[PDB]
Write a protein that holds these residues in place. Structure first.
Motif, PDB file in Angstrom:
ATOM      1  N   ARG B  88     -61.668  11.000  59.155  1.00  0.00           N
ATOM      2  CA  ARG B  88     -61.225  12.361  58.981  1.00  0.00           C
ATOM      3  C   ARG B  88     -61.022  12.887  60.352  1.00  0.00           C
ATOM      4  O   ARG B  88     -61.963  12.944  61.121  1.00  0.00           O
ATOM      5  CB  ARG B  88     -62.353  13.163  58.342  1.00  0.00           C
ATOM      6  CG  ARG B  88     -61.967  14.501  57.836  1.00  0.00           C
ATOM      7  CD  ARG B  88     -62.194  14.524  56.349  1.00  0.00           C
ATOM      8  NE  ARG B  88     -61.576  15.667  55.695  1.00  0.00           N
ATOM      9  CZ  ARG B  88     -60.812  15.604  54.607  1.00  0.00           C
ATOM     10  NH1 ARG B  88     -60.540  14.445  54.020  1.00  0.00           N
ATOM     11  NH2 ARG B  88     -60.411  16.722  54.040  1.00  0.00           N
ATOM     12  N   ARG B  90     -58.604  15.950  62.676  1.00  0.00           N
ATOM     13  CA  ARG B  90     -57.737  17.118  62.712  1.00  0.00           C
ATOM     14  C   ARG B  90     -56.856  17.033  63.958  1.00  0.00           C
ATOM     15  O   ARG B  90     -57.315  16.713  65.049  1.00  0.00           O
ATOM     16  CB  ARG B  90     -58.562  18.367  62.822  1.00  0.00           C
ATOM     17  CG  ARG B  90     -59.284  18.729  61.619  1.00  0.00           C
ATOM     18  CD  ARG B  90     -60.117  19.932  61.919  1.00  0.00           C
ATOM     19  NE  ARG B  90     -60.449  20.561  60.663  1.00  0.00           N
ATOM     20  CZ  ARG B  90     -61.495  21.337  60.440  1.00  0.00           C
ATOM     21  NH1 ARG B  90     -62.357  21.610  61.423  1.00  0.00           N
ATOM     22  NH2 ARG B  90     -61.711  21.769  59.201  1.00  0.00           N
ATOM     23  N   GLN B 100     -51.141  25.860  64.832  1.00  0.00           N
ATOM     24  CA  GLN B 100     -51.337  25.301  63.478  1.00  0.00           C
ATOM     25  C   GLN B 100     -52.045  23.956  63.601  1.00  0.00           C
ATOM     26  O   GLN B 100     -52.169  23.414  64.705  1.00  0.00           O
ATOM     27  CB  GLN B 100     -50.005  25.150  62.739  1.00  0.00           C
ATOM     28  CG  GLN B 100     -49.325  26.486  62.454  1.00  0.00           C
ATOM     29  CD  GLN B 100     -47.920  26.349  61.931  1.00  0.00           C
ATOM     30  OE1 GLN B 100     -47.682  26.495  60.733  1.00  0.00           O
ATOM     31  NE2 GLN B 100     -46.970  26.096  62.825  1.00  0.00           N
ATOM     32  N   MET B 101     -52.566  23.426  62.498  1.00  0.00           N
ATOM     33  CA  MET B 101     -53.264  22.166  62.584  1.00  0.00           C
ATOM     34  C   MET B 101     -53.197  21.516  61.255  1.00  0.00           C
ATOM     35  O   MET B 101     -52.792  22.149  60.290  1.00  0.00           O
ATOM     36  CB  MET B 101     -54.714  22.383  63.022  1.00  0.00           C
ATOM     37  CG  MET B 101     -55.626  23.064  62.021  1.00  0.00           C
ATOM     38  SD  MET B 101     -56.701  21.909  61.071  1.00  0.00           S
ATOM     39  CE  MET B 101     -58.048  23.057  60.733  1.00  0.00           C
ATOM     40  N   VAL B 102     -53.478  20.223  61.214  1.00  0.00           N
ATOM     41  CA  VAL B 102     -53.465  19.481  59.968  1.00  0.00           C
ATOM     42  C   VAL B 102     -54.675  18.584  60.011  1.00  0.00           C
ATOM     43  O   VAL B 102     -55.195  18.297  61.082  1.00  0.00           O
ATOM     44  CB  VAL B 102     -52.214  18.561  59.830  1.00  0.00           C
ATOM     45  CG1 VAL B 102     -50.930  19.373  59.915  1.00  0.00           C
ATOM     46  CG2 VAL B 102     -52.246  17.466  60.909  1.00  0.00           C
ATOM     47  N   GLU B 103     -55.117  18.153  58.847  1.00  0.00           N
ATOM     48  CA  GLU B 103     -56.242  17.253  58.766  1.00  0.00           C
ATOM     49  C   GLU B 103     -55.738  15.998  58.050  1.00  0.00           C
ATOM     50  O   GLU B 103     -55.244  16.070  56.922  1.00  0.00           O
ATOM     51  CB  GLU B 103     -57.383  17.916  57.988  1.00  0.00           C
ATOM     52  CG  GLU B 103     -58.708  17.226  58.138  1.00  0.00           C
ATOM     53  CD  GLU B 103     -59.845  18.112  57.719  1.00  0.00           C
ATOM     54  OE1 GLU B 103     -59.912  19.281  58.127  1.00  0.00           O
ATOM     55  OE2 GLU B 103     -60.669  17.653  56.939  1.00  0.00           O
ATOM     56  N   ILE B 104     -55.763  14.870  58.747  1.00  0.00           N
ATOM     57  CA  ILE B 104     -55.328  13.623  58.147  1.00  0.00           C
ATOM     58  C   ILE B 104     -56.518  12.729  57.819  1.00  0.00           C
ATOM     59  O   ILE B 104     -57.585  12.797  58.434  1.00  0.00           O
ATOM     60  CB  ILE B 104     -54.304  12.840  59.019  1.00  0.00           C
ATOM     61  CG1 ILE B 104     -54.901  12.385  60.348  1.00  0.00           C
ATOM     62  CG2 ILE B 104     -53.111  13.659  59.249  1.00  0.00           C
ATOM     63  CD1 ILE B 104     -53.884  11.729  61.328  1.00  0.00           C
ATOM     64  N   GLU B 106     -55.536   9.320  56.878  1.00  0.00           N
ATOM     65  CA  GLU B 106     -54.977   7.967  56.979  1.00  0.00           C
ATOM     66  C   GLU B 106     -54.053   7.751  58.189  1.00  0.00           C
ATOM     67  O   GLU B 106     -53.990   8.604  59.071  1.00  0.00           O
ATOM     68  CB  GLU B 106     -54.336   7.534  55.640  1.00  0.00           C
ATOM     69  CG  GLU B 106     -52.873   7.718  55.542  1.00  0.00           C
ATOM     70  CD  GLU B 106     -52.495   9.020  54.949  1.00  0.00           C
ATOM     71  OE1 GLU B 106     -52.472   9.088  53.703  1.00  0.00           O
ATOM     72  OE2 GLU B 106     -52.208   9.970  55.720  1.00  0.00           O
ATOM     73  N   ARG B 114     -43.805  14.148  61.388  1.00  0.00           N
ATOM     74  CA  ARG B 114     -44.447  13.907  60.112  1.00  0.00           C
ATOM     75  C   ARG B 114     -45.002  15.174  59.487  1.00  0.00           C
ATOM     76  O   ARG B 114     -45.033  15.310  58.279  1.00  0.00           O
ATOM     77  CB  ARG B 114     -45.551  12.867  60.292  1.00  0.00           C
ATOM     78  CG  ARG B 114     -45.739  11.968  59.105  1.00  0.00           C
ATOM     79  CD  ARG B 114     -46.756  12.559  58.143  1.00  0.00           C
ATOM     80  NE  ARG B 114     -46.880  11.845  56.872  1.00  0.00           N
ATOM     81  CZ  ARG B 114     -46.214  12.173  55.769  1.00  0.00           C
ATOM     82  NH1 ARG B 114     -45.347  13.183  55.778  1.00  0.00           N
ATOM     83  NH2 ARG B 114     -46.537  11.601  54.613  1.00  0.00           N
ATOM     84  N   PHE B 115     -45.414  16.111  60.324  1.00  0.00           N
ATOM     85  CA  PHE B 115     -46.015  17.358  59.902  1.00  0.00           C
ATOM     86  C   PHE B 115     -45.077  18.573  60.021  1.00  0.00           C
ATOM     87  O   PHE B 115     -43.926  18.471  60.424  1.00  0.00           O
ATOM     88  CB  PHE B 115     -47.300  17.608  60.729  1.00  0.00           C
ATOM     89  CG  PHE B 115     -48.172  16.390  60.888  1.00  0.00           C
ATOM     90  CD1 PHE B 115     -48.879  15.857  59.806  1.00  0.00           C
ATOM     91  CD2 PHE B 115     -48.251  15.738  62.122  1.00  0.00           C
ATOM     92  CE1 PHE B 115     -49.664  14.689  59.935  1.00  0.00           C
ATOM     93  CE2 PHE B 115     -49.025  14.569  62.275  1.00  0.00           C
ATOM     94  CZ  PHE B 115     -49.734  14.040  61.171  1.00  0.00           C
ATOM     95  N   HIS B 116     -45.589  19.732  59.635  1.00  0.00           N
ATOM     96  CA  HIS B 116     -44.829  20.977  59.701  1.00  0.00           C
ATOM     97  C   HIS B 116     -44.584  21.456  61.128  1.00  0.00           C
ATOM     98  O   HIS B 116     -43.805  22.377  61.352  1.00  0.00           O
ATOM     99  CB  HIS B 116     -45.507  22.072  58.851  1.00  0.00           C
ATOM    100  CG  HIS B 116     -46.976  22.254  59.120  1.00  0.00           C
ATOM    101  ND1 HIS B 116     -47.493  23.404  59.676  1.00  0.00           N
ATOM    102  CD2 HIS B 116     -48.035  21.443  58.879  1.00  0.00           C
ATOM    103  CE1 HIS B 116     -48.804  23.291  59.773  1.00  0.00           C
ATOM    104  NE2 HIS B 116     -49.155  22.110  59.296  1.00  0.00           N
TER     105      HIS B 116
END
Lengths: 173, 173
Positions: B88, B90, B100-104, B106, B114-116
């Motif tokens: 996990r 971020r 902004q951030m995302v949590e992947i 995989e 790949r992200f926004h």
């Protein structure tokens, strides 16, 4: 803010001007077929106590109730959406804040094909008031999200899980 | 885990088998032109004390040092990467965990598209060991990320901010 209600289209019939929150409007007017919004962003409800179908409206003149995507002509309660300072919301893949997640700060007209994951089941509104739509490009049923937790879809008042777009409740004028 | 080092290609010359972490290897062998990994995921370094260029290796037989993208034949320290239970991480848009951030959860072979959001400047490794590459599709300089904060690029040991892909350090055999 300032909003005026008209029982008849084209800005006619009996009218009621409202300047804030109103739990019930039925004693003032029985049908809304036109509305003028001079300022502020409002949320309108089909029933009293802010229940049933919701509708976001902003500055503009509405000669006909289809101008705000009204299902019919009932408007029995209203809320003035405060001025937000920054918007920050997290979108989760699964319910109760599980799975991958993303944090957005702006409008997304397509939710299922914008991020690294397609499924969307919970939201945590960190800052600001947001409007949630069941369809893409801001169509379909609308649901107001104030700062707080929305672990399951019922929390945002929907009877189903369909979501399609999210837009920050801000004035565009 | 189990790893064996060979000074000469094709699995020849002087060999040194290692079963764990080793801060220095230069007293055992002076050049690595082949390696056999019987088990476990390892990180190898060009210099002693786990410094300089890093290289992730797993089960497989390497007759030539280009098999793991070696810049040259120096391997002076090694680390055995433990067995992770869930990954996990971020990914943040700006430094010090801003934007902004995302949590992947995989592998992502393409980070900037790949992200926004396209810009990537900080990482918080919530769980598990991950490998970071400067290029897409797991190419270029490699950097090991153990659970912790990586607010600025220097924290992950790079001399520049180029990142291209991220993959969970897990065995694939």
């Amino acid at each position: 803010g300032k909003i005026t209600f008209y029982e008849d289209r084209g800005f006619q019939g009996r009218h009621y001007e409202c300047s804030s929150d109103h739990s019930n409007l039925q004693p003032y007017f029985s049908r809304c077929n036109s509305i003028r919004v001079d300022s502020g962003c409002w949320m309108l409800y089909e029933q009293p106590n802010f229940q049933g179908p919701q509708y976001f409206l902003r500055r503009g003149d509405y000669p006909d109730y289809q101008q705000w995507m009204g299902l019919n002509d009932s408007i029995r309660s209203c809320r003035l959406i405060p001025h937000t300072g920054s918007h920050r919301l997290r979108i989760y893949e699964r319910e109760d804040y599980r799975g991958q997640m993303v944090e957005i700060t702006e409008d997304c007209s397509s939710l299922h094909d914008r991020f690294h994951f397609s499924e969307i089941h919970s939201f945590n509104v960190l800052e600001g008031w947001w409007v949630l739509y069941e369809m893409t490009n801001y169509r379909g049923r609308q649901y107001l999200l104030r700062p707080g937790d929305y672990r399951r879809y019922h929390d945002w008042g929907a009877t189903n899980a369909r979501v399609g777009s999210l837009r920050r409740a801000v004035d565009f004028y």
